[PDB]
Design a binder for this molecule. Structure first.
Ligand SMILES: CCCCCCCCCCCCCC(=O)SCCNC(=O)CCNC(=O)[C@H](O)C(C)(C)COP(=O)(O)OP(=O)(O)OC[C@H]1O[C@@H](n2cnc3c(N)ncnc32)[C@H](O)[C@@H]1OP(=O)(O)O
Lengths: 387, 8
């Protein structure tokens, strides 16, 4: 079905993506710029869906409609290689991910069955200023492309991609950014997920991890046993007064990478201000009262498809200026362990390879490919991806 | 996060 390796991607032919303004897989890119110019007259009519299906923009402020969306995502969205785990989306998490500053309701693009009005498709866009090499451009982040399992392999994904493209074209944006575990034309970077076990018994019980060849259950827990409290002086939850300095640290820290977001202070508030079961941010306030570092990870539980529920933490943004990142992420592990997380997940992007092995992370079986729509630029190493 | 990884 999908190609997960570049070698596996040699087989595939892209009947759809060959038509899109994206670089070709095999081609080596030595340029910076769009694949196609801006279109100055935009199709006003929605693209045709297969018979019995119609468009409907999802008003996530409506409770029942938002319930349809997570019920769709909780039952039909991204899975593991072995169909054993699926993300478990809270209504509040979707509001956090789908209603950042500048969100537009028409960018909550759903597909319903005409006769029943049942939600069977979705795709999203949120506004995002992206720094890529020497260029900053207003783009969108495309996420939650989802087709109901009963509708699969019926060419609905190209329509969602092309309709969301049209609705973004109407608002004047011509580039987009998105990530995926499958290989498409053409990844600008490939990042690898690593996993840090916090509650090995539960992880091993549900077969999320295995005991390495020669450990026992009680040996494994001692290997991954963490301090009961964090090491770092003056580590505390982020507060409203920290929003400017958090924005300041994040802005300067991201400048060393080649693929980063460019956040306003209001966007920084939305994405980092702690929300229970959604996002946690802890700042380091030193002996002078200045905030010099922060760590963050978001909450995204996993549903166990055999089935009760696996709570996982995902590294988000971790900025260091005076506190070693190793000690910053070690505190993150401890803070996540307190909060009851079973596993701490992080990609090998940014500076994360410098601490992954030392902090007892184990490499995962899934990659995350980063893509740009209508933007031709050289690929980058994972450590240059800051998105 | 647009991928689900397990420890390999
Ligand atoms: C300026 C504005 C531009 C905005 C647009 C920017 C681009 C938007 C990019 C959107 C990415 C958002 C990032 C995320 O949300 S990644 C998360 C996507 N979700 C999942 O992988 C889990 C749930 N899966 C599904 O619902 C379906 O399997 C999907 C929706 C993935 C495909 O549905 P279905 O199973 O029914 O397949 P089809 O018969 O309709 O279509 C087959 C065609 O679709 C190509 N395909 C398959 N998977 C993806 C994919 N993950 N990104 C882009 N294209 C994909 C496929 O190679 C083939 O094209 P080609 O092989 O002929 O080329």
């Amino acid at each position: 079905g999908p190609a997960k390796t570049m070698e596996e991607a040699s087989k595939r032919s892209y009947q759809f993506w060959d038509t899109q303004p994206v670089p070709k897989l095999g081609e080596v890119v030595n340029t910076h710029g769009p694949v196609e110019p801006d279109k100055d007259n935009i199709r006003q009519e929605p693209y045709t869906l297969p018979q019995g299906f119609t468009w409907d923009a999802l008003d996530l402020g409506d409770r029942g409609v938002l319930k349809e969306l997570y019920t769709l995502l909780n039952e039909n969205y991204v899975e593991d290689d072995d169909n054993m785990f699926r993300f478990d989306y809270s209504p509040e998490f979707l509001l956090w991910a789908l209603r950042p500053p500048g969100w537009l309701p028409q960018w909550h693009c759903g597909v319903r069955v005409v006769s029943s009005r049942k939600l069977v498709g979705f795709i999203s866009a949120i506004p995002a200023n992206i720094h890529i090499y020497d260029t900053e451009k207003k783009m969108v982040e495309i996420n939650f492309l989802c087709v109901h399992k009963k509708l699969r392999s019926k060419r609905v994904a190209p329509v969602l991609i092309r309709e969301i493209t049209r609705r973004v074209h109407l608002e004047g944006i011509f580039q987009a950014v998105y990530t995926a575990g499958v290989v498409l034309p053409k990844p600008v970077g490939t990042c690898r997920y690593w996993h840090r076990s916090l509650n090995p018994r539960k992880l091993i019980e549900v077969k999320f991890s295995h005991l390495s060849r020669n450990m026992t259950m009680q040996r494994t827990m001692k290997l991954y046993r963490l301090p009961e409290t964090p090491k770092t002086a003056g580590l505390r939850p982020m507060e409203t007064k920290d929003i400017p300095v958090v924005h300041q640290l994040l802005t300067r820290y991201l400048k060393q990478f080649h693929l980063t977001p460019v956040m306003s202070q209001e966007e920084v508030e939305h994405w980092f201000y702690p929300q229970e079961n959604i996002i946690d941010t802890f700042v380091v306030e030193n002996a002078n009262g200045e905030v010099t570092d922060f760590l963050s990870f978001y909450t995204l539980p996993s549903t166990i498809m055999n089935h009760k529920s696996l709570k996982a933490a995902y590294s988000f943004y971790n900025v260091h200026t005076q506190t070693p990142l190793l000690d910053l992420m070690s505190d993150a592990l401890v803070l996540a362990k307190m909060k009851g997380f079973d596993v701490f997940n992080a990609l090998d992007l940014m500076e994360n390879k410098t601490f992954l092995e030392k902090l007892k992370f184990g490499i995962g079986d899934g990659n995350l490919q980063y893509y740009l729509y209508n933007w031709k630029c050289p690929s980058m190493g994972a450590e240059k991806v800051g998105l | 996060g647009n991928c689900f990884s397990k420890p390999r």
